[PDB]
C-alpha cells in the first residue's frame, strides 16, 4: 500500500535475524506471506530471445485501394530442436500489422520473448494453439501437435471480411481470428527462438506451394511492388552487421494502406480558354505526327489495303482528316492535357513572337514514303529545350493521369498482381504512379514529355506553380560511462547521408526531445552542417556517404571539436572548436540521432587500429579513444519509441496532479489540472492517464442510503467514478479501463482506434462454440456519450461516470449521471485492468478519479489492495497514483543478437531462414504491470536496482542460519540456472 520501498525490506531483514540468532517463526512467516503471491517482489527468470523475420510483401485493405483482398502463403518447417535451452523453442507463423508490430529484441510484455503473438497487432499460430494479445487459446487440429520438422503451415488472410485462417498439413484448424482492425499493412511473419529452420513458400518462383491455395486466394508473391525485389528481412532493427562492424539503423520509411490508393486532381471542372482552339489544334496535330513518325520508323509501316488494320493503323496523313468520331478523338487529344495543366497550376500562353513560324513544321528525315507518311514535326526540341522544372511538371501531369487511370480500374474492379493476368483483372503496373517502376514511368510520360515541350515551343507561359516521436532514434553510451575529465575521441561513419546528428550528450538526456535542440546535447548535424546546442548554428559543411566524423571533447579545456575525414570542420567565424566553453557538469556521453532510413557506424574506438583517421586527428593531440581499454563492447541505449505509462512528474511544466483527501460526502479523488491552460506555450494534446495499480478479475469465473454489511461482505462489484470538471467538454473524454499492454499514443484518438480482435473457435462442422473478444482498452465513449441540451453547454453537473466492474461475472457496465449506459463489456478470466481516462484538455480543471463506493458496493481500494480486501472505507494509498503515457523511453541494446541466416535456397526450396545458436537473458518481471525488462537494464534504473538488491538480501536473510526449508522455498523463486547465469554474467 505504499509502493516498492526498500526500508520495509530492511525492516523485514531485521525481523529475520537478531544478533546472529535466527527467529524461525519470523522467517517462516515472511516466506509464507511475501513469497507465494509473487506480486510484490520483482520476479526474475531466464527467458530466451525471440527474433521475427518477415517477407517484404505488404497487403492491406482501404477504400479504393489497389491491393487485393485475399492472400495466402506457406511456411515449411525443416528442423526444430525442442528445448535447446531450458525453455521450449518458440516458433510461430502468422500475419502482422506494420502500424504497431514492434518486436524489439529482449524484454517486452509478459515474461518477454514476444513473437507473432503477444500483441493485438500481430496474430500467430504455433502447432497447438493460436496467439494474440498475449493469450494462448487451444484450437482443435487433427495432429494437435506443436510445430515440428516436416510441417506445412498454410496461412490465409481474407480482408474483405477480416479473417486469418490456418491449415496445418492440409487439414484446416477449427478456429480463426476475425473482426480485427484493418488499418496498416499485413505481412507474413515467422518468430523463433533459435534451433529453428523454416522455409518460406510464397507461390510461384519464390517458393512453390506444397498444398493448393484456397479458392480465391492469391499466392503471396504477387504483391511484391515493381520497385522492390522479394526478400526476407527482420521487422524492425535498430542495428545491423556491416563489414566494418555494428551499423546503427534508424527507423523505417514504411508504407501505409492509404499509399496504395490513387488520388488524382479533378480536370473536368476546369474550363478551357480560347487558347484551346488557338493551340490545342496544332498540338494534337503534332501528336499525330509523333505517332505517324514512330510507325514510319519501321515496325508499323502502313499499307493502303485497309485504313487501320494490324501494323497499318496510321491513316489520313498527319492531319485530322478523319470522320467525325475519330475527328473528335483526335481533337480532344491536347485538350485533356490542357485540362490537366490548368488543374495542376500550369498557365496557358501564346506565341507572342513568331515561335510557330520559327518552328520548321517539317521533320528532318522527311522520308514521307506514303501520302499518310507526311509527318510535319516542328523540331520543337531543336528550337526550345526542356527545362528541368518543366520535366518535373511532366512528372506531375503523368502522375495525375496514371492516378485517375488507377481510379478508373479500381472502380471497374482491377486489383494489383506482379504477374500480369487480364481475365483476373490484375496488372503489374496498376500501383500508384509514385510506386511505379521506372520503365512504366517512361512509358507513361513518353508522349507527355514531347507534348509539354511543344506547349513550350508554342510560347506557353507554363511554369511551376512519419509518426511523431518515431522520426529519429537516439543511441547513446551508458550513463555509467559519463566522462567528467580528460580528452576523448569517438568516430561516426555516415553510410547513408541524412539527418544523423552526432555529438556529446549529458547523462540526463530526454528521449523524446530532439538531439541538440535542448541544452542537454552538443551535436553536429551533417545533413546540412549545422551544430546544435540550443538551436541550429552554421558550422563546417555537409558530409557524404562514407564520411566519418571524429568527434572530440576536451574536458580539460572545456571544448568540443568536430572533424570530417581528419580535416577539422571550421566554424563560420573561423575557429576550429565548435563549442569554445562547455561546463563539465555531470559528464558527457557519445550520442547520435539517426533519422528515418539512415545508417551510421558509431565506432567508439575499442580497437585503435580499427579507428580510422585517428592518427590524422586525435592522436598526438592528446585524445584518448573513447572506450579503448574497455574489454566488453560499450552497452548502448536507444530511444525505444514504444509508448509506456510512467507516473506524472511533479515537475511537469504543463500538468499537475492533486491528491485531494476523502473528507465527507466526497470520496478520495485524484484531480488532474492543466497547469498552464489559457496562456502562452499551453500544450493542448491528447492525454492518456491511468491509475498505477490494476484490479485483477476473479480467476475462476464463477456464475455468481443505508448500506447492507452482509452484501458488502459478499459482493464482487468493485468500481469507482470519474468526475469531469465543468469547462472540459465531454466530447474529448474517454472513461474506462486498459489492459496492461495498451501502447497507443494516438494524438487523434477515438473508439475506432481501439485495438480489437475476435478469436472464434468452431468445431469440425463449422458451428461456432466460442467467440471470445480481445481489446487493449474497454472504455465507454465519453467522446460521443453525454446528456443533451440546447444551452448550458458547460453544464453544472460533472458528468460523473461510474465504472461498475464485477470481478467474478466479468460484467463491465458503465453508468453516467445516475443512468445506466447501454455500453457493457465482458472479458476473459485472469485479466488485469487499470482505471484509465483519455482526455484532451479544454479547461483549467479537466477531470478527476473519484475512488469511492455506492450502496452495497465495495471500493476500488479493496480491488487493488489485498490487506483491505473487506474494508468498505475508500482510500488513496501512496501507491495509487496517476500515470501518463510517455511517447519514448530509453532501452538498453542487448550485447549479443540472434544471428539469423536467410537465403533463397531455390525455386522449389523457396526461402530458408535458420537460427541455430541460442541466446538467453535474465528477465525482471514487474508483476502488477505484466511487463518484463532486462535485469541488466537496472544499471541505469537505480530506483529498482536498490529495491531488488534489498529483495536479494531479504531472501538471503530468510534463508539465514541453517533454514533449509526456506532455502528450498527460495530455490523455487531464484533457481540455480539464474544463479549460475548471474555468476557468469559480466554486464
Amino acid at each position, epitope marked *: 500500500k505504499h509502493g516498492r520501498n526498500h526500508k520495509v525490506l530492511d525492516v523485514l531483514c531485521s525481523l529475520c535475524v537478531c544478533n546472529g540468532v535466527a527467529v524461525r517463526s519470523n522467517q517462516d512467516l515472511i516466506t509464507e506471506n511475501l513469497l507465494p503471491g509473487r506480486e510484490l517482489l520483482l520476479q526474475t527468470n531466464l527467458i530466451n530471445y525471440v527474433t521475427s523475420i518477415r517477407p517484404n510483401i505488404f497487403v492491406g485493405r482501404a477504400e479504393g485501394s489497389t491491393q487485393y483482398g485475399k492472400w495466402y502463403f506457406e511456411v515449411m518447417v525443416d528442423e526444430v530442436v525442442p528445448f535447446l535451452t531450458a525453455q521450449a523453442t518458440h516458433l510461430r507463423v502468422g500475419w502482422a500489422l506494420t502500424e504497431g508490430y514492434s518486436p524489439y529484441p529482449g524484454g517486452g510484455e509478459g515474461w518477454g520473448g514476444n513473437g507473432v503473438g503477444d500483441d493485438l497487432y500481430s496474430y500467430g499460430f504455433d502447432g497447438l494453439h493460436l496467439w494474440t494479445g498475449h493469450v494462448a487459446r487451444p484450437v482443435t487440429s487433427p495432429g494437435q501437435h506443436l510445430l515440428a520438422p516436416e510441417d506445412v503451415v498454410s496461412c490465409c488472410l481474407d480482408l474483405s471480411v477480416p479473417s486469418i485462417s490456418f491449415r496445418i498439413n492440409g487439414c484446416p484448424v477449427q478456429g480463426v481470428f476475425e473482426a480485427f482492425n484493418l488499418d496498416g499493412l499485413f505481412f507474413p511473419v515467422v518468430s523463433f527462438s533459435a534451433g529453428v529452420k523454416v522455409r518460406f513458400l510464397l507461390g510461384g518462383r519464390h517458393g512453390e506451394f506444397k498444398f493448393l491455395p484456397p479458392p480465391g486466394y492469391a499466392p503471396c508473391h504477387e504483391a511484391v511492388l515493381p520497385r522492390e525485389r522479394l526478400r526476407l528481412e527482420p521487422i524492425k532493427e535498430y542495428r545491423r552487421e556491416g563489414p566494418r562492424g555494428p551499423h546503427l539503423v534508424g527507423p523505417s520509411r514504411c508504407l501505409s494502406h492509404t499509399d496504395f490508393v490513387p488520388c488524382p486532381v479533378d480536370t473536368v471542372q476546369i474550363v478551357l480558354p480560347p487558347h484551346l482552339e488557338r493551340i490545342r489544334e496544332k498540338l494534337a496535330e503534332n501528336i499525330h505526327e509523333l505517332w505517324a513518325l514512330t510507325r514510319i520508323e519501321q515496325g508499323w509501316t502502313y499499307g493502303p489495303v485497309r485504313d487501320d*488494320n*494490324k501494323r497499318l493503323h496510321p491513316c489520313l496523313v498527319n492531319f485530322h482528316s478523319l470522320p467525325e*468520331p475519330e475527328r473528335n478523338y*483526335n481533337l480532344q487529344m491536347s485538350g485533356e492535357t490542357l485540362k490537366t495543366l490548368l488543374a495542376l497550376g500550369c498557365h496557358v500562353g501564346m506565341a507572342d513572337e513568331k515561335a510557330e513560324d520559327n518552328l520548321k513544321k517539317t521533320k528532318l528525315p522527311k522520308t514521307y514514303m506514303m501520302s499518310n507518311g507526311y509527318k510535319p514535326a516542328p523540331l520543337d526540341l531543336s528550337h526550345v529545350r526542356l527545362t528541368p522544372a518543366q520535366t518535373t511538371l511532366v512528372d506531375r501531369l503523368a502522375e495525375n493521369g496514371h492516378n485517375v*487511370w488507377a481510379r478508373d480500374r479500381v472502380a471497374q474492379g482491377w486489383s494489383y498482381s506482379a504477374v500480369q493476368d487480364i481475365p483476373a483483372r490484375r496488372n503489374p503496373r496498376l500501383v500508384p504512379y509514385r510506386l511505379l517502376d521506372e520503365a512504366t514511368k517512361r512509358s507513361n510520360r*513518353d*508522349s507527355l514529355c514531347q507534348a509539354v515541350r511543344t506547349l513550350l515551343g508554342y510560347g506557353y507561359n507554363i511554369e511551376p506553380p512519419q509518426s511523431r516521436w518515431d522520426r529519429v532514434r537516439i543511441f547513446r553510451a551508458e550513463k555509467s560511462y559519463t566522462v567528467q575529465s580528460g580528452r576523448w575521441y569517438f568516430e561516426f561513419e555516415a553510410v547513408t547521408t541524412g539527418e544523423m546528428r552526432v555529438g556529446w550528450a549529458r547523462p540526463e538526456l530526454r528521449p523524446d526531445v530532439e538531439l541538440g535542440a535542448d541544452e542537454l546535447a552538443y551535436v553536429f548535424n551533417g545533413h546540412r552542417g549545422q551544430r546544435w546546442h540550443l538551436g541550429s548554428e552554421p558550422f563546417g559543411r555537409p558530409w557524404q556517404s562514407g564520411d566519418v566524423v571524429g568527434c572530440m571533447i576536451d574536458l580539460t579545456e572545456n571544448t568540443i571539436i568536430f572533424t570530417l575525414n581528419g580535416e577539422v570542420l571550421m566554424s563560420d567565424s573561423g575557429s576550429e572548436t565548435a563549442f569554445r566553453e562547455i561546463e563539465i557538469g555531470d559528464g558527457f556521453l557519445p550520442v547520435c540521432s539517426l533519422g528515418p532510413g539512415q545508417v551510421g557506424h558509431l565506432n567508439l574506438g575499442q580497437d585503435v587500429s580499427s579507428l580510422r583517421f585517428f592518427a590524422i586527428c586525435g592522436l598526438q593531440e592528446g585524445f584518448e579513444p573513447f572506450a579503448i581499454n574497455m574489454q566488453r563492447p560499450v552497452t548502448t541505449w536507444f530511444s525505444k519509441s514504444l509508448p509506456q505509462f510512467e507516473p506524472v512528474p511533479p515537475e511537469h511544466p504543463h500538468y499537475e496532479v492533486a491528491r485531494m483527501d476523502g473528507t465527507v460526502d466526497t470520496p478520495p479523488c485524484l484531480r488532474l489540472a492543466h497547469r498552464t491552460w489559457g496562456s502562452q506555450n499551453s500544450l493542448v494534446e491528447m492525454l492518456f492517464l491511468r491509475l498505477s495499480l490494476p484490479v485483477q478479475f476473479h480467476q475462476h469465473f464463477r456464475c455468481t442510503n443505508r448500506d447492507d454489511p452482509e452484501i458488502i461482505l459478499n459482493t464482487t462489484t468493485y468500481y469507482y467514478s470519474v468526475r469531469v470538471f465543468a469547462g472540459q467538454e465531454p466530447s474529448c473524454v474517454w472513461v474506462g479501463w486498459v489492459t496492461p499492454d495498451y501502447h497507443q499514443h494516438d494524438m487523434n484518438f477515438d473508439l475506432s482506434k481501439v485495438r480489437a480482435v475476435t478469436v472464434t473457435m468452431g468445431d469440425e462442422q463449422g458451428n461456432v462454440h466460442s467467440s471470445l473478444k480481445c481489446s487493449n482498452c474497454y472504455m465507454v465513449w465519453g467522446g460521443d456519450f453525454v446528456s443533451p441540451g440546447q444551452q448550458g453547454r458547460i453544464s453544472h453537473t460533472d458528468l460523473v461516470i461510474g465504472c461498475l466492474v464485477d470481478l467474478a461475472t466479468g460484467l463491465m457496465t458503465f453508468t453516467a449521471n445516475g443512468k445506466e449506459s447501454n455500453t457493457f463489456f465482458q472479458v476473459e478470466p485472469n485479466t488485469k485492468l487499470f482505471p484509465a481516462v483519455f482526455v484532451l484538455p479544454t479547461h483549467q480543471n479537466v477531470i478527476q478519479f473519484e475512488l469511492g463506493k455506492q450502496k452495497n458496493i465495495m471500493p476500488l481500494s479493496a480491488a487493488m489492495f489485498l490487506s483491505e480486501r473487506k474494508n468498505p472505507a475508500p482510500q488513496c494509498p501512496p501507491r495509487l497514483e496517476v500515470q501518463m503515457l510517455m511517447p519514448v523511453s530509453w532501452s538498453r541494446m542487448p550485447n549479443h543478437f540472434l544471428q539469423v541466416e536467410t537465403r533463397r535456397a531455390g525455386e522449389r526450396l523457396g526461402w530458408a531462414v535458420q537460427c541455430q545458436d541460442p541466446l538467453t537473458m535474465m528477465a525482471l518481471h514487474i508483476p502488477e504491470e505484466n511487463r518484463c525488462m532486462d535485469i541488466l537494464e537496472l544499471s541505469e534504473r537505480l530506483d529498482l536496482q536498490r529495491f531488488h538488491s534489498h529483495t536479494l538480501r531479504l531472501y538471503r536473510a530468510v534463508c539465514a542460519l541453517g533454514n533449509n526449508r526456506v532455502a528450498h522455498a527460495l530455490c523455487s523463486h531464484v533457481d540455480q540456472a539464474q544463479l549460475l547465469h548471474a555468476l557468469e554474467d559480466a554486464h
Partner: nanobody
Amino acid sequence: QVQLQESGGGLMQAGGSLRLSCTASGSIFSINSMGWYRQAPGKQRELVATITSGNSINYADSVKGRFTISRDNAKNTVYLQMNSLKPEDTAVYYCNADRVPNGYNPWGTPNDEYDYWGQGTQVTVS
C-alpha cells in the same frame, strides 16, 4: 462506371446468323470502339473488329467468318452479327468499350489502358 451489359448468345448450328448485343453504359468517352474480345477455351482472347463510333470497320484476327459488327450508336448497343458460325466462335464473348478506335492510338500508354471489359457470354457453336 462504364458497365457493359452483355446479353446472352444463343446456341445454334454452324452457319447460323446470330446478333450479339452489348451496352457500354457509363462515361461518354472511351467507348467509341465497342468491338468484342472473345476469349477461346484455353487460348488467348481474340480481337473482333473494334468499329469506331461511326461504325468504321477494321481488319481483326478473328474475321474468319463475317463478323459483321454494327453498333447501333442511338443507344450505344454494339450488335456483332455472326452469320457463319464456326468451331472457332464457340468462345466466351466479351464486348470491350476501349478508347482507341480501330486500334489507332496517337495517345499515351495510360490512355491506351482505358479499356472497359464486358460481362462475358459463352456463345457455343453446334
